[PDB]
Amino acid sequence: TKGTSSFGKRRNKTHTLCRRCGSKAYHLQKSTCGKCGYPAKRKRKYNWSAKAKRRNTTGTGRMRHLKIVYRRFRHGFREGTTPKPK
């Protein structure tokens, strides 16, 4: 009864897709993610999970702004100028 019979009635789901981390962790009843802590302002992270911390770090994603920041710093962070025209 506690096994195969009990596995039949898994009809309603408790976790849904979070809109901040994208993982399927947002708990419906508690309104909390448990993977990033969406209602909390600060991202949830712990030092006892090094692999979990490295899974979502600064280098994991696109860095669409960080890469251009690095390039601008490399070239001198200049603005408002153009190369000499032909």
Q: Annotated binding site for Zn(2+): which residue ranges?
A: 18, 21, 33, 36
Q: Output 21 or 27, the one with its CB closest to Zn ion.
A: 21
Quickly tell me which residue has 């708990």 as its tokens: 27
Applying CB under 5 A, the span of 2-10, 26-34, 58-66, 71-79 interacting with Zn ion comes to 26-34
* Residue 59 interacts with, from Zn ion, RNA, none (CB under 5-8 Å by kind): RNA
3-state secondary structure 13-66: CCEECCCCCCCCCEECCCCCCCCCCCCCCCCCCCCCCHHHHHHCCCCCCCCCCH
Among RNA, Zn ion, none, residue 71 binds (CB under 5-8 Å by kind): RNA
